[PDB]
Amino acid sequence: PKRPTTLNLF
Amino acid sequence: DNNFYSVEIGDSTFTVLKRYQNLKPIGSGAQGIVCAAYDAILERNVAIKKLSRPFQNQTHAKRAYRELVLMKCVNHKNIIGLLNVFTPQKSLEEFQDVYIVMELMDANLCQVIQMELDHERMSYLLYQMLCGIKHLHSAGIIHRDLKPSNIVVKSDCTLKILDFGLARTAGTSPEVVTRYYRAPEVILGMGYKENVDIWSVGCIMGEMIKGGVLFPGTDHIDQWNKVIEQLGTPCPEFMKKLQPTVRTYVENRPKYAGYSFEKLFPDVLFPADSEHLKASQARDLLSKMLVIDASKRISVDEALQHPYINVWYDPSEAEAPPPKIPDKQLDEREHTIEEWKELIYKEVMDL
Ligand SMILES: O=c1c(O)c(-c2ccc(O)c(O)c2)oc2cc(O)c(O)c(O)c12
Ligand SMILES: [Cl-]
Structure with a gap:
């Protein structure tokens, strides 16, 4: 799997 | 000036x-x-x-x-x-x-728990957390007080551990570690090895999943109840390892069955099992971290091989050279207010 690059901190 | x-x-x-x-x-x-x-x-x-x-x-x-x-x-x-x-x-x-x-x-994890995360994300954040911790362990240092609010993250989904104010090598036999995250070793009179941090890690992961604090005790005693109500009452060999006076209370506590991880963490709480990285696979890791007995509990190294974490394994990130502690500076030697003031200023003054 691809590692995530993204996190929704809003 | x-x-x-x-x-x-x-x-x-x-x-x-x-x-x-x-x-x-x-x-x-x-x-x-x-x-x-x-x-x-x-x-x-x-x-x-x-x-x-x-x-x-x-x-x-x-x-x-x-x-x-x-x-x-x-x-x-x-x-x-x-x-x-x-x-x-x-x-x-x-x-x-x-x-x-x-x-x-x-931001810090607090606002991650209130989120729903995919396995990819969560497990990887935990994988990071572990490396980060492993680094401290590889110098024999123990963080001692990992918690949501001591963990920070960025929008590229990266994670870091902080606040080493309490960090120490192993200890023996004044509770300064935060109530909810206290290991059994810590709650009771016992000494701690490093997997005391794995207990914290268990607490944190469990929290993310729960969307709330796992063992939420009202007072420093209730907190034990919170554990035992959950995971059951310690087996007699663990009971033996206790100080004689508090050994008596623990024995006297009701003999809870304590719920199975599948009831502790039902599926309604998880997302959905992509390419394995599953509800069970995590649950199993929980089931190997949150162990009352420290000696029976998984270590970091092991937590890192455990399938659900293992899919991000990078030895350049995992087996990194440990930090170099300037020689015998840890050795907690208990100095005078006067000696202290100086020691520090010598560490501030490098320029
Ligand atoms: O960067 C930090 C940081 O160093 C700290 C911090 C807080 C306490 C420490 O002892 C320490 O060494 C670092 O705290 C926070 C808290 C946040 O909510 C946040 O978004 C942050 O980016 C940070
Ligand atoms: Cl996405």
Whole structure:
């Protein structure tokens, strides 16, 4: 799997 | 002198290098006080921790040292990076406070728990957390107080561990670690190896999943109830390892069955099982971390091989050279208020 690059901190 | 200035954030005053402006309060934890601010030289965000009269008390200085020393020489991507240490006072004479500058992250886990995350994400954040911790362990250092609010993250989904004020090598036989995250070893009278941090990790993961604090005890005693109600009552061999007087209370506590991990963590709480990285696969890792008995509990190394974490394994990130602790500086030797004040100033003064 691809590692995530993204996190929704809003 | 002409190199610093002062700002009034709340009651606390920040007397800091002119380089640093537009300061704003963010947190504190309990071991210092932190503002985020703008470094103007480097034109980037930073975090400044102020340490007021750290030498004033003996415990109050133990933490500052620990922090200062560890921050100097730790070298991992999953640990907050140091940027600067400074002091506004001109020489040891008038020396009062220390300021540490370090990276600014986007937020701490608190607002991640209230999120729903995919396995990819969550497991990877945990994988990071582990490496980060492993780095401390590989020097025999134990974080001792991992918690949501001591873990920070960024929008590229990166994670870092911070606040080493409580960090120490192994200990024996005054509760200073945060109620909910206290290991059984810690709750009771016992000494701790490193997997005391794995208990914290268990607590944290479980929390993310629960969307709430796992063992939420009303008082420092109820907190044990909270554990035993959940995972059952310790087997007699664990019971034996206890101090005789508190050995008696633990035996006297009701003999809870304590729920299976599948009831502790039903599926309604998880997302959906992509390419394995599953509900069970995690649950199993939980089931191997949150173990009352420390000796029966999984270590970091093992937590890192455990399938659900193992799919991000990178030995350049996992088996990194351990940090170099300047020789025998840890050795908790209990110094005078006077000796303390000096020790620190020698660590602030490198330039
Ligand atoms: O960067 C930090 C940081 O260093 C700290 C911090 C807080 C306490 C410490 O002892 C320490 O060494 C660092 O805290 C926070 C808290 C946040 O909510 C946040 O978004 C952050 O980016 C940070
Ligand atoms: Cl996505």
